[PDB]
Amino acid sequence: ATEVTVLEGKTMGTFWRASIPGIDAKRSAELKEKIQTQLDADDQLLSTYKKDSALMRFNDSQSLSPWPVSEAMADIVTTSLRIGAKTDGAMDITVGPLVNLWGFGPEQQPVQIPSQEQIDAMKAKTGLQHLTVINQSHQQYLQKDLPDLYVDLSTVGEGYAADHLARLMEQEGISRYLVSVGGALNSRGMNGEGLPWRVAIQKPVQAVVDINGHGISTSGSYRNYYEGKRLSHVIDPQTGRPIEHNLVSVTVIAPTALEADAWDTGLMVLGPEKAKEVVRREGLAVYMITKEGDSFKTWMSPQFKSFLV
Ligand SMILES: [Ca+2]
Ligand code: NA
């Protein structure tokens, strides 16, 4: 039994954690500095709450020509656009202005219920089709065909950050770790007890999965979870209205946390029936919780079940 060192801090409006076994204390001290520095840089790349972030500079710009961005920005957006297509638009990184219209952004509250005409007009300003990624040998770009398109990567940033943290671990010669950024995690190697890192999914008891060599993410709709007296604040990108189905939690295991974090949001928006079709077609490892009145129901794909201990 070797000691597991735990490092923790703040990033992206949430928290990160890194567990590492058998690492001495001057190393884990330095590693925290590097982790926080990297996560600060990722936050500065992606945040919609930082006014001079790379993403916000693009958002504020009125240009319809290619806008230079980093490799990570290009790849995050490519992944998001494609999983958006594969979830029939349900995962939409351009939906922000519809969310703001409702006042359902996390740093805002009171606004009138918008009219459908208002919603439909606002939809003209959103859509996965409006965004393009351009890759070349030493450069890459985003390009929007609408000046007032607004890109929000908050639904995939944790997954990216978690994958980027694993890259950092490798860089620093760390072979065994459990790293998390918000709801996204990557697992590799054995813990202090010589066993796979414990990753639990809540089943209303904890069901345990071994996701060694994989990543995981969960997305939910919680305004109903704890009662249904209220609406979801999850907006369907296609209707511009709150989702109406009973799916309250989706957990995805994938080779990368970014993929998991992209899928879980899309599947959540789709609801049980449509999500299951996507999960079947794409061969995804997914765990779903639905709330019927007062009762909770769960569903796991076969691919998810492979991860159960
Ligand atoms: Ca997500
Ligand atoms: Na549109």
Author numbering: 12 to 215, 222 to 244, 247 to 328
Q: What text does the study give?
A:
We recently reported a flavin‐trafficking protein (Ftp) in the syphilis spirochete Treponema pallidum (Ftp_Tp) as the first bacterial metal‐dependent FAD pyrophosphatase that hydrolyzes FAD into AMP and FMN in the periplasm. Orthologs of Ftp_Tp in other bacteria (formerly ApbE) appear to lack this hydrolytic activity; rather, they flavinylate the redox subunit, NqrC, via their metal‐dependent FMN transferase activity. In the current study, we identified a bimetal center in the crystal structure of Escherichia coli Ftp (Ftp_Ec) and show via mutagenesis that a single amino acid substitution converts it from an FAD‐binding protein to a Mg2+‐dependent FAD pyrophosphatase (Ftp_Tp‐like). A high‐resolution structure of the Ftp‐mediated flavinylated protein of Shewanella oneidensis NqrC identified an essential lysine in phosphoester‐threonyl‐FMN bond formation in the posttranslationally modified flavoproteins.
Therefore, we conducted extensive crystallization screening of Ftp_Ec wild‐type protein reconstituted in vitro with Mg2+ and FAD in an attempt to obtain a crystal structure of FAD and metal ions bound to the enzyme. There are four monomers in the asymmetric unit of each crystal structure, and the r.m.s.d. of the monomers within each structure ranges from 0.5 to 1.6 Å and 0.3 to 1.6 Å, respectively, between the two structures for approximately 300 Cα carbons. John Wiley & Sons, LtdIn the site previously denoted in the Ftp_Tp structure as metal binding site 1, a single metal ion is bound in the wild‐type and Ftp_EcE169K protein variant structures. Aided by the high resolution of our structural data, two water molecules were observed bound to each metal ion and thus the coordination number for the metal is seven, consistent with a Ca2+ rather than a Mg2+ ion as observed in the Ftp_Tp structures. Refinement of the metal in this site as a Mg2+ ion resulted in large positive peaks in a difference electron‐density map; these peaks disappeared when modeled as a Ca2+ ion. Thus, in agreement with the original structure determination, we have assigned these as Ca2+ ions. Superposition of three representative Ftp_Ec monomers illustrates the inherent flexibility of the loop region near the active site comprising residues 237–253. The Ftp_Ec structures suggest that in solution the cores of the Ftp enzymes remain stable, whereas a single flexible loop adopts different conformations during the catalytic cycle. Recombinant wild‐type Ftp_Ec was able to flavinylate RnfG_Ec in a Mg2+‐dependent manner in the presence of FAD (lane 4), suggesting that this type of posttranslational flavinylation reaction indeed is a protein‐dependent FMN transferase activity, rather than an autocatalytic one.
